[PDB]
Nucleic acid binder design. Structure first.
Lengths: 356, 94, 54, 178, 55
DNA sequence: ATCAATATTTTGACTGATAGTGACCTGTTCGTTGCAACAAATTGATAAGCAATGCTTTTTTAGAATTCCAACTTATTGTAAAAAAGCAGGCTTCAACGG
């Protein structure tokens, strides 16, 4: 070219130059233009050096102890962009798709821009374990699973031949979400006086019906017919009818009695509405339930319970109250694996055995 | 046009300037003009006007509601003199 | 994991004089820069040399 | 990995067996034949159970070896674990009575340990870590070491087949042992 | 959780002197700055020395 | 087994982008500078603000509730080969009604 080397680029990276005004500008290998970035020297070079994370521009790579096997191909950061175009055609609910994007985004700021047959299993483990040392173990499991299905679909499109991610293991969580007893229940309901009125009503309604907080904010006064409570879960899709004759003596809460309270005080189209006579979100209900938790002053071991824990407390109560098969059909749950993993205590209460 | 309506109109015009910036900018300018007159210095903005300080001799005041004589000290009072450009543009009657 | 200027020079293809090691930092010939912490640079566990020329 | 003490030792004993079971050469050189030659060698000797753990442990080593980038394949996933059947006979009521009486020549704590292990049905591991402070108002707080389950066996139980009472057994340990 | 003057310095890349660490505190070379409690200083968990100078 | 032709083996010409400095153009900032605008100074008849302080009305005020934004932590659920029917887009002929 006209200017191969100079006494100005002599202290600058391949991209980025310096004008006659002491200013610096970084070139663009897509049009041949540039933008002015920096007035200093050690700043423009320390800025036009991370985009420079990809001089492929000479240099190759090799760690301590390893083999060789390569040839030629294309980028990969782009594959993460084409993978998102495939997931949007798999027909997924509008909530699960977002869960995947968040993970793919973490993969972006985790692994270096690199071809696909370059990212070795060791590189994926360095990033994976990085989240484990931070405590986030449940995250590393989802990030690994997602990054695993991405390469699987990649191999099915003539790009890769192996799945290095399948080589590394996945973290094993322990679920440190403490449960909620019946005694701590009244302790929170008593401190829910400073909070709105719909909170206490939806708090008892969430323990008398044992439904999800999401479907709890979807019930209307038209879903009640002949004394039944037609509820259509959105998560699974199961359909059940809850009788308005239920009752919890362990807390002294009647089903019908609780329902009527939401018809006078609250009032509206939905069973649980706001002070403005409007339906609330599933993130605001469990939100205020937290305030009464912290304001209480009680202490636990691990992670404080939640509004969803009310569903668990509801199941444990109905167990000893009536039967076991009763606290299974009401929760809109089937199978025979979670019915037991939802009755446990997880280091809280001793499993006392009685003469029976 | 109030202290708030004054910021809104200026923010609407200046788009390349944050609305929040114009808000605090106006408040700081007024506070600056209020502090200057408090120290004893006078303001003089060419084209707008000028803020001087006139002295008031101490006199035995009165209560226009009861009629009780109240003591009054010297004290100064802020005065504004319209500028050349201000008087012409405002005056709609030659 | 961050190392010192002495510990870093010990884990390279060829250990040179401390003077030369300090020179590379000043000339910005290592990704990423050491960043002076007090009065002794702190290399990154992945900070390798690059070398320029004209 | 963060596991129990005794557990980590069990794996170590398996690794040492692999040492004197396979030559010292690169992982990419080890063939599936040599792996099965050593494995089956322990199956014929009668120790089929040991072969399963050694095969399941040696496989994990390679799987973690590939993670580091050492090799590319796990030549252990091509083999097949030998199915072993438990041959440890059970115990009946008649047999127990014959052993308890034969424990006469033995000290005075074995008989108590027998009745206790049958009245509580607990594991030998926790039965030795049981303190008299665990008993609280007619209960028996037991913290299982293996699983970690927490239960409370009341001092009212009694086996109606051998003639043993939980209460009479505990008090018999406070008088004799102490 | 707040670490002390000694505890914080005992977790840095290179442990220094107690008087040295005290100097940074006065030079604001500690971001964020420690909090006065009793007679000693309490640093933040993610507290790290910085350089407030642009040559 | 050796001629014989075409794809094969490195160099050179082709054509516009790649490379990095330099000139071009002028916003934008700072120092020199000119000038409309501001201030002092009169004199005297007429218009507007003035002292205090509780009650009432208007404008600014510091949060705080509410909800989308967001990086994390959980809770459930779980299909593919292998056949063999079940529908409509348009050209194709027999079968029934009208002359």
């Amino acid at each position: 070219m006209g200017r191969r080397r100079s006494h100005e680029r002599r202290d600058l990276p391949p991209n980025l130059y310096i004008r006659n005004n002491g200013y610096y500008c970084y070139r663009d290998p897509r049009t041949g233009k540039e933008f002015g970035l920096g007035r200093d020297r050690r700043i423009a070079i320390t800025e036009a050096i991370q985009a420079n994370i990809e001089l492929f521009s000479g240099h190759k790579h090799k760690p301590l102890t390893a083999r060789i096997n390569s040839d030629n191909s294309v980028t990969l950061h782009s594959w993460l962009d084409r993978y998102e175009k495939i997931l949007a055609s798999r027909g997924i609910k509008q909530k699960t798709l977002i869960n995947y994007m968040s993970k793919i985004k973490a993969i972006r700021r985790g692994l270096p821009d690199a071809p696909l047959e370059d990212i070795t299993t060791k590189e994926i483990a360095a990033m994976l374990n990085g989240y484990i040392d931070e405590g986030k173990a449940a995250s590393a499991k989802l990030i690994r699973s997602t990054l695993s299905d991405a390469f699987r679909e990649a191999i099915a499109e003539g790009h890769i031949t192996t799945n290095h991610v399948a080589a590394t293991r996945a973290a094993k969580s322990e679920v440190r979400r403490s449960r909620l007893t019946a005694d701590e229940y009244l302790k929170i309901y008593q401190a829910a006086e400073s909070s709105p009125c719909w909170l206490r009503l939806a708090m008892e309604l969430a323990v008398v019906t044992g439904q999800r907080v999401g479907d709890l904010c979807e019930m209307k006064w038209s879903d009640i017919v002949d004394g039944y409570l037609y509820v259509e879960q959105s998560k699974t899709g199961v359909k059940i009818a809850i009788p308005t004759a239920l009752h919890i003596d362990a807390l002294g809460i009647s089903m019908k009695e609780t329902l009527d309270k939401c018809k006078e005080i609250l009032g509206g189209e939905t069973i649980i509405a706001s002070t403005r006579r409007e339906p609330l979100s599933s993130g605001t209900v469990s939100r205020y339930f937290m305030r009464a938790r912290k304001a209480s002053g009680l202490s636990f071991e691990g992670d404080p319970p939640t509004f969803h824990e009310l569903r668990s407390l509801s199941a444990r109560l109905y167990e000893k109250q009536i039967s076991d098969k009763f606290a299974q059909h009401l929760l809109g749950h089937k199978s025979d694996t979670m019915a037991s993993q939802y009755r446990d205590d997880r280091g809280r209460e001793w499993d006392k055995i009685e003469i029976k | 046009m109030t202290k708030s309506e004054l910021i809104e109109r200026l923010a609407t015009q200046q788009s390349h300037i944050p609305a929040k910036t114009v808000e605090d900018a106006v408040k700081e300018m007024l506070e600056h003009m209020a502090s200057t007159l408090a120290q004893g210095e006078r303001i003089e903005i060419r084209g707008f006007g000028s803020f001087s300080l006139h002295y008031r001799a101490p006199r035995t005041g009165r209560n226009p509601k009861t009629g009780d004589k109240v003591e009054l000290e010297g004290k100064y009072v802020p005065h504004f003199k319209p500028g050349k450009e201000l008087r012409d543009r405002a005056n709609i009657y030659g | 994991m961050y190392l010192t200027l002495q510990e870093w020079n010990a884990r390279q293809r060829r250990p040179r004089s401390l003077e030369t090691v300090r020179r590379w930092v000043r000339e910005s010939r290592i990704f990423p820069p050491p960043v002076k912490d007090g009065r002794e640079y702190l290399f990154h566990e992945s900070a390798v040399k690059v070398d320029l020329n004209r």
